[PDB]
Amino acid sequence: TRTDITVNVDGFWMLQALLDIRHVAPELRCRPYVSTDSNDWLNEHPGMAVMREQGIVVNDAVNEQVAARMKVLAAPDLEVVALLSRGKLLYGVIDDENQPPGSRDIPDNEFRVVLARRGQHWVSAVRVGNDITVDDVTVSDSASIAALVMDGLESIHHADPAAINAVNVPMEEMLEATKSWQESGFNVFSGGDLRRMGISAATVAALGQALSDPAAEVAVYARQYRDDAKGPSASVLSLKDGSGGRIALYQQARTAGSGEAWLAICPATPQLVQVGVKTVLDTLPYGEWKTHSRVSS
Amino acid sequence: MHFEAYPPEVNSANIYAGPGPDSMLAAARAWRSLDVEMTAVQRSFNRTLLSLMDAWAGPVVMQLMEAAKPFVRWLTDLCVQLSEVERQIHEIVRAYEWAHHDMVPLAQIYNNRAERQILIDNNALGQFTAQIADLDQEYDDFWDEDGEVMRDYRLRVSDALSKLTPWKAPPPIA
Amino acid sequence: NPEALTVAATEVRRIRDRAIQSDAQVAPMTTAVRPPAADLVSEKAATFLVEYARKYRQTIAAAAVVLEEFAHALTTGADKYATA
């Protein structure tokens, strides 16, 4: 019926310890596992018993399918991350003085999804609050990923695509202008600089609202691993729901000769979102995303 | 235990604070002096016994020798144990120096967090997000690294202490 | 030969005095060990070594008792055989 599994942070750590996994995606925000000379020093304590009752652990051994999924998370060829939030996305930041150093908490308004692919196997790990749910997820094309993302976001908040003319603007100029605009709190009156860049008034308004007071946000990006090394996708897709509708922000991939990068400011229309996901996957450092593997020889 | 239960700030700050190895080194010196003196003590005792055995060599003296045998053995064993203490203390100080050296400097951690925060402040358009994640992975790597360092530190110290065996009460001479 | 037992008793007491003196003069160093850092491992090592020092001191005290009783016995044997 259902193959999904749910554990808290410590339960995930016990899975790591049993399967000898040093670390997983940082977005899941677990604590590392360092193997000592004894693994009986985490013992059998009740966190383990709960997992014994859920069929997650049989005897002292982890469930086989679950162990396989955790294997996928442990050393993926490809990672695809989405950070979702109700309201402004804080990217993991909880502003509190009582937050401990290296806190494994995440903001209450936030939850993160990690799709890992090892070989041909796709595994989902969803972090909401203190809970992590691991399961099998089916992925084929950029569009399917975009579908998963859109479902996740629409579940937080429902928004129609903003009505604006899609436009490409120079990346660093846009960064500087936006950084100056952020000082005024993205007031539409202070958006003269962005209007000078050739961005439409409607776009500056919808973006101003989306940056000033978003209803929901999503950040989608990928990671690729080869041998000892790794690299991030050069582009990040950002969805932001403003009172003037939902906006998609993603950079177009650079030329073979490079020289500069472009930022695409678009409506959230499904076509343009498929485009955004596709560009994110195509900005990965090693080869094509779908068929790639971290083993060279 | 498992020191990865704690963040890099804790393990690094912990290993970098404190008075240092000096008081251990001093102790080592002291334990060496003991090792010397007691060896002399041993050598004198056994000489004294022999002297007695040479002076009388009657059944009474042999009885005394038999009576004092367990204490002689005990004194010997005591010297053997004494010779170990300096050695193991220095092994421990070594372990500490290596833990102190291999640990991730606080400044690298601080730098990591600071860079992360700078990226956050500039992230309104969301394009620094993957880099932020990278910085988080580096922080987790510091976490793990400090974990391993403290593991090895613990193991070395444990191995050294295991070689210092409990002092035993001297037997009566009788 | 009583005088031999007397001599041996004297030597035994000297030996005892040496053991006691050596224990005493380095006691301040062995029991003063501090943890080099604030971590649990350093603390464990320092505490162990301090306790080890203290227990050693106890052991030496006991050995001094044994030696003093031995010397007393030698003196007693000396008097016993000298009167004879």
**SS3 of C57, please?**
helix
d(CA B45, CA B68): 10
Tokens of B80: 């053997």
Question: Residues A233-248, buried b or exposed e (16+ Cβ, 10 A)?
Answer: bbbbbbbbbbebbbbb
Residues in C closer than 8 angstroms to B8, CB to CB, are: none
The half-sphere exposure of A252 on its side-chain side, counting CA atoms within 13 A, is 17
Residue A49 CB burial class (10 angstroms; 0-12, 13-18, ≥19):
exposed
**SS3 of A246, please?**
strand
Straight-line distance from the first to the last Cα atom of chain A, in angstroms, rounded to the nearest whole number: 39
d(CA A178, CA A183): 9
> Do B38 and C45 make contact, defined as CB atoms within 8 angstroms?
no
> Which candidate, A230, A207, A255, places its Cα nearest to that of A79?
A230
Q: Where does A35-186 show beta strands of DSSP type E?
A: 57-58, 61-62, 78-86, 110-118, 121-128, 131-136, 167-170
Q: Measure the CA angle with vertex A162, ends A161 and A167; round to 5°.
A: 110
Do A7 and A132 touch, CB atoms closer than 8 A? yes
Question: Which of C8, C36, C56 is facing B51, going by the closest CB pair?
Answer: C8
Residue A161 gets which letter from DSSP? B
d(CA A150, CA B5): 36
d(CA A241, CA A231): 29
The half-sphere exposure of B164 on its side-chain side, counting CA atoms within 13 A, is 25
Nearest-by-CA chain B residue for C34 = B23
| Entry field: residues in chain B | 174
Question: Which of B126, B140, B143 is facing A236, going by the closest CB pair?
Answer: B126
Do B18 and B103 touch, CB atoms closer than 8 A? no
C-beta neighbour count of A214 within 10 angstroms: 22
Nearest-by-CA chain B residue for A179 = B122
d(CA B148, CA B103): 9
What are the angstrom distances between the C-alpha of B10 and each of A152, B17, C35, C38?
Answer: 37, 11, 16, 10
Beta-bridge partners for A122: A117
Domains of chain C are 1-84 (1.10.287.850)
| Entry field: residues in chain C | 84
The coordinates were experimentally obtained by X-ray
Q: Which helix (H) or strand (E) holds A220?
A: strand A216-226
At A86, give phi and psi (nearest 5°): -85, 125
Tokens of B166: 């409990």
Do A14 and A33 touch, CB atoms closer than 8 A? no
Q: Where are the alpha helices (DSSP H) in chain A?
A: 9-19, 47-53, 64-74, 142-156, 171-181, 192-196, 201-212, 270-282
d(CA C41, CA C38): 9
d(CA A236, CA A283): 9
Distance of CA A85 to the CA centre of its chain: 11
User: Chains with 3 or more CB pairs closer than 8 angstroms to A?
Assistant: B
User: To the nearest whole angstrom, how far is the Cα of B3 from the nearest Cα of chain A?
Assistant: 8
Beta-bridge partners for A229: A226
Straight-line distance from the first to the last Cα atom of chain B, in angstroms, rounded to the nearest whole number: 47
Nearest-by-CA chain B residue for C48 = B161
At A296, give phi and psi (nearest 5°): -80, -40
Do B173 and C66 touch, CB atoms closer than 8 A? yes
Do A224 and A75 touch, CB atoms closer than 8 A? no
> Which candidate, A216, A268, A209, places its Cα nearest to that of A244?
A209
Do A216 and A90 touch, CB atoms closer than 8 A? no
d(CA B105, CA B87): 29
Distance of CA A6 to the CA centre of its chain: 19
Question: Which of B126, B131, B148 is facing A232, going by the closest CB pair?
Answer: B131
What's the Rg (C-alpha) of chain A? 21
Do A45 and A35 touch, CB atoms closer than 8 A? no
Domains of chain B are 1-174 (1.20.1260.20)
Question: Residues B20-53, buried b or exposed e (16+ Cβ, 10 A)?
Answer: bbebbbbbbebbbebbebbbebbebbeebbeebb
Question: Which of B15, B153, B173 is facing C66, going by the closest CB pair?
Answer: B173
Distance of CA A256 to the CA centre of its chain: 27
What letter represents residue B152's amino acid?
A: D
- Give domain limits for chain A: 1-297
d(CA C78, CA C84): 10
Q: Could you say which residues from 106 to 165 on chain B have a Cβ atom under 8 Å away from some Cβ of chain C?
A: 150, 153-154, 157, 160-161, 164
Pairing of strands A262-267, A245-252: antiparallel
Q: Quick check: B60 contacting C, CB < 8 Å?
A: yes
d(CA B140, CA B130): 15
Question: Which of A42, A100, A249 is facing B125, going by the closest CB pair?
Answer: A249
> Do B2 and A42 make contact, defined as CB atoms within 8 angstroms?
yes
Distance of CA A99 to the CA centre of its chain: 23
What letter represents residue C42's amino acid?
A: S
Do A234 and A251 touch, CB atoms closer than 8 A? yes
**SS3 of B167, please?**
coil
d(CA C9, CA B163): 36
Do A200 and A164 touch, CB atoms closer than 8 A? yes
Beta-bridge partners for A124: A115, A135
> Do A37 and B155 make contact, defined as CB atoms within 8 angstroms?
yes
Do C77 and B60 touch, CB atoms closer than 8 A? yes
| Entry field: residues in chain A | 297
The half-sphere exposure of B63 on its side-chain side, counting CA atoms within 13 A, is 7
Do A194 and A52 touch, CB atoms closer than 8 A? no
> Which candidate, B85, B172, B44, B73, places its Cα nearest to that of C62?
B172
Residues in B closer than 8 angstroms to C32, CB to CB, are: 23, 26-27
Do A136 and A5 touch, CB atoms closer than 8 A? no
d(CA B2, CA A112): 27
C-beta neighbour count of A12 within 10 angstroms: 26
Residue A189 gets which letter from DSSP? G
Residue B171 gets which letter from DSSP? P
> Which candidate, B15, B13, B10, places its Cα nearest to that of B152?
B15
**Ramachandran region, residue B7 (left: φ > 0; alpha: ψ -120 to 50; beta: rest):** beta
What letter represents residue B53's amino acid?
A: M
Pairing of strands A131-136, A5-8: antiparallel
